[PDB]
Symmetry: C2
Subunit: 729 residues, 2 copies
């Protein structure tokens, strides 16, 4: 028999929600998704279509604060058995009211609603036509909006939040005198939602500010007293730097839980993961633990994973609200993978996408690079980091002491690791035109000149109007677009000295050049330390020597690498010796110091977006404290608070968006915020990661391309006035 | 027409209630009577059928606390115009939330319900069947129960009152730890009311006490905190003594209200009421004022009476909640004329009911006395103050010093004003049997002996089991039952001296004896000072002069007064000379000190109950002061709280009922409270009014007869446990 709802579950892409009622699954009306009774438990199944057409499942069970143990028990039981019915391939999530995951919150753009009552109280999700209602909702949140039913009284109020007095046919939105316009904008979406989803469009919504309360409101609440200040410390976040985690091994029936340390500090090795066991990725310091199930683990402890996680949270004395995710071997999520050195799937060198696809990007089309059509697609710009083809007008300066000195035009494309340069580029991309200032910092540039280049960069931006895009690039991690500014020649980077008045230092004895190519066909030749154990099967290298030139071409190489590899030889003034990987003369091996171990890690080209999906966060340095809050769901322009500083974390680059009305001391710390963000990432990513500062209204193509609903005129009119113009119309 | 709802108004006995909605009268569902929204105004019409078949109208308009001036204005307009439609024969009342008059409150025994909202907020009474409810009701009140809708939060609770969590199909009644069993009983009525009148009996109600809150309750309220004490500022009723009042004349062209004093202190003279004007009886101290309208007052001033009342209240600086009643000349009520000394009706000496019948006794059937069936009816006992025919066993003692001296059996029936007596009597009334102790105190008895008689009276009551009825009577104000103790012989009372040993005193040469008869037929001859201006046409008189003895029989006299007067002559051993009112020989007049004024006014031997309806109150001395609270509506055994001291005030006598669980000080102070009650009465009634102390479970026939549903077993089982059996069943 197995239960009738299971037969409807996960049959096609979408969202399904059931409430557990007396050990039974009862469908919640689709128009009411987002509403959860505080004393109930729910089961939420999200189905996504992977790129190969296969279906992916995210199973969450939600627990209200006033929820008992028999109900939450029934929920955990259903999650387990439902996962089994779906062939144990679902990722499982335990969500607790007020602390649910970003994945979960992303499913409700309109926001969440916490209602008083539940099954034990005889309440149900029902919105008949003729209905009598008298409830008060307190709206809180900037990135994730939560509307909680509170007692209908002045005592529930404060002057900082917005409240909604729902009287049925009349919906009164009230916002405190100290409420921010963005918050009121959000409050309005909840009110509109009630009008449209409940009531079905047949209801009047009127918005009011403190001090202008209507008669209706005054009638049921009574005369307005003096109001309190909002308690910002409701759940004030202060998770500055939390990048550490531990890996445990577990084996238990459900009671005799044996836990043993396996890794005291991430990055963890993918090897520590054994298919015969279950592991617990402990990231509790950031309120989240992962339970990993090996594909050959016993059925008894597989079906006890949820309980196991609980016992772990107890024995570790963690808050009950800790976030829990259980993943099956082979179906690991990006958030889990990020904790390991170099995660390589032994069945993903081919195929389409990965075994998992983050919900917030499942709807994004993967557009391949096409130089000829690039200027007509912001999506392409964003996916390949190319604001334009790179053939626009540019100026290149070297920093000498404290001044900008023009670089000899004939030298363009050539850079010396002993200096720091600044580049002004004018880009043209149909939809937009602008400038980009690149600040390149050579690994051997002296501190004073590096510091001087940053300042000169900021000053150029300012004497240009504060309109340009500002990007900080470090030698070694040059971004794709910077690479394509030199016709078809690879960007050459000598780890050598300067190139000013007179360097004379460069033509050493044995130099090695690594030629890496980008999605846009762009290439760059970088000099490193001559050693076998530094080669890469993908890109192609060039080994200079007093004998001859070795044009080593790795098996994983291609057109772009080779072509660019040799164009370097012409510059170096030498004749190569095309040598294919594996079969290379021992003459080559000696010009490195032996013959160590290669590096055959296949670059996640297309799979890049899948393994490291982009994430959007909000920045706050307020009171010497650095805090970041992620904004869930599909990226929307509406989420960009003009008084905030946002971070669009691409994997290959970090964008920092600064709102027109943010504070001066925060837009000045833009770059610093990005660095703090990057030095804090649990993934322990390269600190050289390029950083790009964008200004509201002058966002580049590779930025907007990530937002499908992008409209330049969006800020021509105050969004809140726009919103207000819809309700009362 | 004037209004289609006016056509349905007061056509037959009953209660009609309209809610004022946007200047219109909208009928309230009868099963919801008692329910009132705080932001609205209402019009209530009580129609009582008089004894002569005619209809009587009590028109009230009730104003909620969050009610607007226009809605309240509309209600007053409708009251005035509805009175006009009813040919201005109605008595109008202004009722304010929380301070309604006893008359109004008497229409709702189950209690009053103050709901949140009103027309401005879009609320209605007419509510569909399938409805989703979630409300909290706070119930306060001992005599009059008021349940107020409050926010659904623990913040609304206290450990003293009871609260009802109305969740629809289930009603949860919670009572604080410090709640009285009587209050719980009262709260239970509201719960059953909600289940029966709302929900159509289709609901479950559970009763719980603090500490045992159920799951459904904790689910919507959250965990229970530590609750506060209840504010005992019930009202403080700081009006221990309010017997003073003033009478003003109010002449106003329209707005210029000219107020002028016409009677500084009450009693007032009925002749002060001139049909050409409007008067204001001021009893603000006790929170009430009446406006009297002359039958020949200007139409422009009658239709302005309500406004005139308001202006008076603001001018005199009284509280806005002050109760206001406006009545028409000829349509006065008992509470109004009680302020006037000797009130008379033009053409009512012939009839039944002085044009006004108090709602709480409208259903009581008048039953004429009949010794043959007395023992068969408690109603007859109560209405005639006869616990039985008075042929029971008795013992009479005269108090001498500190001792009870048995009276000479052959003297039984003769009382001397210089003594005090104690009479122990055994009554037999089909329904029950018991004992009564009469303490007769003579007007010329010395303080020590008067004092000693009270103590000995209370002492006898105690050593007899605290079971007898205890009655204090003063010479000249003998109660009917006491007069019947002496066979057919009348109770002879000489203002004389003593009947003890050495006591030759008071043998005056000329003596006058007024021979009165009671509705029951008993009679008493009271020695009065010999003056013509002391005669009364209603009863017979005996004049004893040294020369002769006269038997003066007034025109109103009956066979009862004559037989009593001659039975007296017989005791004085004098041969009578009968004379009839009208032909008084000059010897008669010259003996009385010369002919003088008279007193031929007839008595209320039937309309007595109409002119002075019985009233029930509760007593207390909370903070050293004396407070009385009236219990509205029809007298009911359930309103007799076993831990209270009640006053059943007929006009003839004052019954003081002592609950078995009242404080020792309270039942020891019974008599004092009663006297205190009489000394404070506005009516300025005789300070000699008999007082009768009654004990719980031993109430005499003349007391229980006032309660139409008396059950002698009612206290066998605790009422709360009894009632808890009707709801939890």
């Amino acid at each position: 028999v197995e239960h009738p709802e299971f037969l409807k579950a996960g049959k096609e892409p979408g969202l399904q929600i059931w409430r557990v009622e007396k050990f039974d699954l009862v469908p919640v009306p689709p128009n009411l998704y987002g509403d959860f009774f505080t004393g109930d438990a729910y089961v939420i199944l999200k189905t996504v279509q992977l790129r190969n057409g296969i279906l992916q499942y995210d199973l969450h069970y939600w627990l209200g604060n006033e929820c008992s143990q028999d109900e939450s028990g029934a929920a955990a039981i259903f999650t387990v058995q439902l996962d089994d019915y779906l062939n144990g391939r679902a990722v499982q999530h335990r969500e607790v009211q007020g602390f649910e995951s970003a994945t979960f919150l992303g499913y409700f753009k309109s926001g969440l609603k916490y209602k008083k009552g539940g099954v034990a109280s005889g309440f149900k999700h029902v919105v008949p036509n003729e209905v009598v209602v008298q409830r008060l909702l307190q709206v809180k949140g900037r990135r994730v909006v939560r509307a909680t039913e509170v007692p209908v009284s002045w005592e529930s109020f404060n002057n900082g939040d917005c409240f909604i007095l729902d009287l049925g046919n009349n919906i009164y939105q009230w916002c405190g005198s100290k409420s921010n316009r963005f918050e009121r904008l959000k409050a309005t979406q909840v009110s509109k939602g009630i009008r449209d989803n409940e009531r079905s469009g047949r209801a009047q919504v009127s918005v009011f500010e403190e001090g202008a309360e209507p008669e209706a409101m005054l009638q049921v609440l009574g005369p307005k007293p003096t109001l309190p200040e909002a308690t910002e410390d409701t759940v004030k976040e202060d998770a500055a730097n939390r990048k550490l985690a531990k890996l445990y091994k577990v084996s238990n029936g459900a009671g005799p839980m044996v836990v043993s340390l396996v890794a005291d500090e991430n990055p963890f090795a993918q090897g520590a993961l054994r298919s015969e066991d279950c592991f617990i990725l402990d990231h509790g310091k950031d309120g989240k633990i992962f339970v990993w199930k090996g594909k050959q683990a016993n059925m008894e402890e597989r079906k006890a994973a949820l309980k196991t996680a609980s016992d772990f949270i107890s024995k570790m004395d963690y808050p009950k609200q800790t976030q829990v995710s259980v993943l099956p071997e082979g179906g690991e999520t990006p958030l889990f993978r990020q904790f390991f050195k170099n995660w390589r799937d032994p069945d993903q060198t081919e195929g389409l996408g990965l075994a998992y696809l983050s919900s917030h990007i499942a709807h994004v089309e993967r557009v391949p690079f096409d130089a000829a059509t690039l200027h007509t697609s912001t999506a392409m710009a964003a996916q390949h980091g190319m604001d334009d083809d790179g053939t626009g007008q540019k100026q290149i300066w070297r920093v000498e002491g404290s001044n900008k000195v023009p670089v000899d035009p004939a030298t363009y494309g050539q850079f010396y690791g002993g200096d720091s340069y600044i580049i002004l580029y004018n880009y043209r991309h149909g939809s937009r035109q602008g400038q980009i200032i690149y600040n390149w910092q050579g690994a051997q540039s002296t501190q004073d000149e590096v510091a001087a280049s940053a300042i000169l960069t900021a000053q150029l931006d300012e004497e240009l109007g504060g309109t340009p895009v500002q990007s900080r690039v470090v030698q070694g991690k040059e971004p794709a677009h910077l690479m394509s500014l030199f016709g078809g020649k690879p960007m050459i980077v000598y780890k050598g000295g300067t190139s000013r008045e007179g360097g004379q230092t460069a033509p050493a004895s044995t130099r090695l050049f690594q030629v890496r190519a980008s999605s846009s066909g762009a290439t760059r030749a970088v000099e490193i330390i001559p050693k076998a154990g530094a080669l890469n099967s993908n890109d192609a290298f060039v080994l200079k020597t007093p004998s001859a030139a070795y044009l080593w071409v790795g098996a994983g190489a291609s057109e772009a690498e080779k072509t660019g590899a040799q164009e370097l030889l012409r510059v170096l003034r030498a004749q190569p010796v095309q040598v294919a990987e594996g079969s290379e003369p021992d003459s080559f091996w000696e010009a490195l110091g032996g013959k160590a171990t290669y590096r055959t890690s296949p670059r996640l080209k297309d799979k890049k977006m899948d393994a490291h999906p982009p994430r959007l966060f909000a920045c706050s340095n307020k009171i010497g404290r650095f805090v970041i809050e992620e904004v869930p769901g599909e990226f929307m322009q509406e989420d960009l608070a003009t008084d905030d500083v946002m971070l669009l974390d691409t994997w290959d680059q970090v964008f920092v968006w600064v709102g027109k009305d943010s504070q001066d001391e925060e837009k000045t710390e833009a770059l610093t915020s990005a660095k703090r963000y990057i030095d804090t990432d649990p993934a322990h990513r390269d600190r050289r990661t390029p950083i790009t500062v964008v200004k509201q209204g002058f966002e580049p193509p590779s930025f907007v391309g990530w937002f499908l609903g992008w409209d330049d005129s969006y800020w021509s009119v105050d969004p809140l006035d726009r919103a207000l113009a819809e309700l009362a119309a």
